[PDB]
C-alpha cells in the first residue's frame, strides 16, 4: 500500500508533515527561556556510552554572533538547514550591511520546510520533509526574542518553549515558573531544574549544553568549567 509524498489526509492535513512531527518525540530535550536580559538555550546531550566524547556532540550551534540555535529530532537533517541559515544571514550582511533580525532568518529557513516533491522539480530537491525542530534565540533591535520552528514551516515567537521527548512534561512546568520579571541568572537556574527531572541519567557538567545571548555580548556557550558553578547552586 503506497501513496504519494504529497497526499492530503481526508482528515485535512499532509500525511508526511503530520508524520515528521512524530520524529521529534524521539529526540533529545531542549528548553529556551526568553528574558529581558537575554535568551538561554539548554539542551541535554544524551550520551549513550562512557566511550563517547561528550564534546563532539553539538546541539547548540552559532548561526551568527547574535543568533543561537538548538536542535531536537534527527540532528542529521539540521546540517542542511543550519548551513542555509548561515549563508542567509551572511548574504543579508553582504548586501544591506547590518545584522539580520532573528525573525527574518527563521522565516528564510522555514521556506524550505515545505519543499519536498517526488517529481516536477530538480534532480536535487528534497524528497522528504526535514525531521527537525529548532529554537532560534537571538538578540537584535527588538531586544531578545526566541522563535520556535517545526517541520511544518510554521514558526512563532515564544516566551519559553520546550521541545523533544519532554515537550509535554516540561512545557507544563514552564507555565508555573515563568514570569516577565526575570534576569538571566534566574532563568539558567530555572531551566536546569526542569531539565534535571526529565533526563534519564544524572545531571553532570557533561550532560547539557548551555548558551546565552545577551544585549551586551555575543552568543556565548558555557564551557565545562562554568557549568560546574550553576549546578553547584542547584
Amino acid at each position: 500500500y503506497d501513496r504519494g509524498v504529497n497526499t492530503f489526509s481526508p482528515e485535512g492535513r499532509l500525511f508526511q508533515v503530520e508524520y515528521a512531527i512524530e520524529a521529534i518525540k524521539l529526540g533529545s530535550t531542549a528548553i529556551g527561556i526568553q528574558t529581558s536580559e537575554g535568551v538561554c538555550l539548554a539542551v541535554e546531550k544524551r550520551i549513550t556510552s562512557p566511550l563517547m566524547e561528550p564534546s563532539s556532540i553539538e546541539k547548540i550551534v552559532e548561526i551568527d554572533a547574535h543568533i543561537g540555535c538548538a536542535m531536537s529530532g534527527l540532528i542529521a537533517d539540521a546540517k542542511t538547514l543550519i548551513d542555509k541559515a548561515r549563508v542567509e544571514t551572511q548574504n543579508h550582511w553582504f548586501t544591506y550591511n547590518e545584522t539580520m533580525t532573528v525573525e527574518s532568518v527563521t522565516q528564510a529557513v522555514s521556506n524550505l520546510a515545505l519543499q519536498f516533491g517526488e517529481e516536477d522539480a530538480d534532480p536535487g530537491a528534497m524528497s522528504r520533509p526535514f525531521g527537525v525542530a529548532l529554537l532560534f534565540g537571538g538578540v537584535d533591535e527588538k531586544g531578545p526574542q526566541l522563535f520556535h520552528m517545526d517541520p511544518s514551516g510554521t514558526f512563532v515567537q515564544c516566551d519559553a518553549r520546550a521541545i523533544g521527548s519532554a515537550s509535554e512534561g516540561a512545557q507544563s512546568s514552564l507555565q508555573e515558573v515563568y514570569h516577565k520579571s526575570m534576569t538571566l541568572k534566574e532563568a539558567i537556574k530555572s531551566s536546569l531544574i526542569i531539565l534535571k527531572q526529565v533526563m534519564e541519567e544524572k545531571l553532570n557538567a557533561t550532560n547539557i549544553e548551555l548558551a546565552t545571548v545577551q544585549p551586551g555580548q555575543n552568543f556565548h556557550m558555557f564551557t565545562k568549567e562554568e557549568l560546574e558553578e550553576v549546578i553547584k547552586d542547584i
Partner: protein, 238 residues
C-alpha cells in the same frame, strides 16, 4: 477507496477527492471575516495561540499598498502564495507605473493554483485567502479556495465555525453599504464573535484588523491599536 491518492484521478461519482480534502485544510484554520462598504473593505481575523507562553500566528499578511490577505490553512503554503503576489504587484509598478487592479491579481493566483491540480503527484495549495483590495472600482473582497475557484463577494468568511458568521453577515448585508468606517468594523467583530465558544470573548491579544479605503493604504492593527475598536463594542449576551 483508491480515488484519493492523486489529484490526477477522477472519482466514479464525478469529483476529485484530493481537491475536496485540501478544502478541509481550510476548515481547520482560524476563523476570519471580510466585509466591505462602498469606501472601505475590512479584514477582521481571530488569531490563535497554541500555548499559554506563546504569541499568536499572524492571520493578516500585507501584500501591497492597496491589497491585504487573510490566510487559513497551512502557513508554509500561505507564504508561498504571498511571495508570488508581492512579486506580481512589483511587476506592475515596474512596467505600467500603476497599482495592479485586484480583479486581475486574483486571476493570476487562479492561473497558478489551477496548474498543480492537474499534474501528477503535485498537490493543491492547502490555504484559502480573503483578498481585501481597493482600486478604480471601489472596494472588493475575493475568496480563494484550494480548488482554484474564486468569487467576488460583498462579505465572506472562511475558517473554522465560519458558518456561524456567514449567517450573521447574511442578515445584515443590507446595512453594510451605508456604514462609516468605525461602524463597519463593529459588524465584522460582532460576526467574528459568533465563531467563538460561548465561554470566551474577543480580547486585544487575539484579534487582528485590516482596513483599506479610498484614501487609506492598507494597514494592520494589533495589540493596542485594536483597543479603539473593542472599546465601544456591544456586549454579546447569551
Amino acid at each position: 477507496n483508491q480515488y484519493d491518492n492523486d489529484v490526477t484521478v477522477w472519482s466514479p461519482q464525478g469529483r476529485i477527492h484530493q481537491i475536496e480534502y485540501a478544502m478541509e485544510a481550510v476548515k481547520q484554520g482560524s476563523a476570519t471575516v471580510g466585509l466591505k462598504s462602498k469606501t472601505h473593505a475590512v479584514l477582521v481575523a481571530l488569531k490563535r495561540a497554541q500555548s499559554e507562553l506563546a504569541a499568536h500566528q499572524k492571520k493578516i499578511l500585507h501584500v501591497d499598498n492597496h491589497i491585504g490577505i487573510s490566510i487559513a490553512g497551512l502557513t508554509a503554503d500561505a507564504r508561498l502564495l504571498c511571495n508570488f503576489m508581492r512579486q506580481e504587484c512589483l511587476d506592475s509598478r515596474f512596467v505600467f507605473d500603476r497599482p495592479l487592479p485586484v480583479s486581475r491579481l486574483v486571476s493570476l493566483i487562479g492561473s497558478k493554483t489551477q496548474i498543480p491540480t492537474q499534474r501528477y503527484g503535485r498537490r493543491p495549495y492547502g490555504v484559502g485567502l480573503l483578498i481585501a483590495g481597493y482600486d478604480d472600482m471601489g472596494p472588493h473582497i475575493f475568496q480563494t479556495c484550494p480548488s482554484a475557484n474564486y468569487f467576488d463577494c460583498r462579505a465572506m468568511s472562511i475558517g473554522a465555525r465560519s458558518q456561524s458568521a456567514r449567517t450573521y453577515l447574511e442578515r445584515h448585508m443590507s446595512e453594510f453599504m451605508e456604514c462609516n468606517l468605525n461602524e463597519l468594523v463593529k459588524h465584522g467583530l460582532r460576526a467574528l464573535r459568533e465563531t467563538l465558544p460561548a465561554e470566551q470573548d474577543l480580547t486585544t491579544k487575539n484579534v487582528s484588523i485590516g482596513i483599506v479605503g479610498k484614501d487609506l493604504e492598507f494597514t494592520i492593527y494589533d495589540d493596542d491599536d485594536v483597543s479603539p475598536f473593542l472599546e465601544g463594542l456591544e456586549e454579546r449576551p447569551q
